[PDB]
Amino acid sequence: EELCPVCGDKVSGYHYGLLTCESCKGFFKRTVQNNKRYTCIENQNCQIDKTQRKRCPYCRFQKCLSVGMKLEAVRADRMRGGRNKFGPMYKRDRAL
DNA sequence: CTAGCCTTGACC
DNA sequence: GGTCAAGGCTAG
Ligand SMILES: [Zn+2]
Ligand SMILES: [Zn+2]
């Protein structure tokens, strides 16, 4: 589906385990790269959509985890390019 | 911090 | 050599 499972924005490709928008790709990568830790200021279940996703990073990252984005696809040694161990996992979603 | 566009590079 | 998901860069 053309819709980001985190926020509903236009999907730009497989990112970190599944189809996501460009923004949720960037956000997940920044968070995991730098071990960022956020605070929800309401009740830890804010609605995430294209126009609210900036408002609560905590609940945005919670939802990234929840829909299945993978911490392991973020690379510790920051190598660019090539293909990770999910390259073949992306094969069977392109069949489903 | 955000998010669009750019560059890399192992796999095929 | 081409693909396309990694990481990189930078206005705003
Ligand atoms: Zn998204
Ligand atoms: Zn929240």
Quote the tokens at residue A95: 């069949």
Encode burial over A31-69: b for 16+ CB neighbours within 10 A, e otherwise.
bbeeeeeeeeeeeeebebeeeebeebbebbbbbbeeeeb
Q: Which nucleotide is closest, CA of A51 to its C1'?
A: B2
- Cα torsion A40, A42, A45, A47: sign: negative
Quote the tokens at residue A64: 């990234």
Q: Report the C-alpha gap between A39 and A41 in whole angstroms.
A: 6
- Listed residue (A56, A48, A59) closest to A6, CA to CA: A48
Other beta carbons within 10 Å of A17: 20
Q: Report the C-alpha gap between A20 and A2 in whole angstroms.
A: 9
Q: Which residue is nearest to nucleotide C8 (CA to C1')?
A: A80
Q: Which nucleotide is closest, CA of A56 to its C1'?
A: B1
Q: Report the C-alpha gap between A70 and A49 in whole angstroms.
A: 20
**Residue in the block written with tokens 């200021």:** A41
**Residue range A1-96, CATH number:** 3.30.50.10
Which ligand has an atom closest to residue A58 CA?
Answer: 2
Quote the tokens at residue A19: 């189809």
A90 neighbors A44 (Cβ within 8 angstroms)? no
Classify A59 as helix, strand or coil: helix
Quote the tokens at residue A50: 């294209």
Domain range summary for chain A, segments of one domain joined by +? 1-96
Nucleotide B5 C1' to residue A22 CA (A): 10
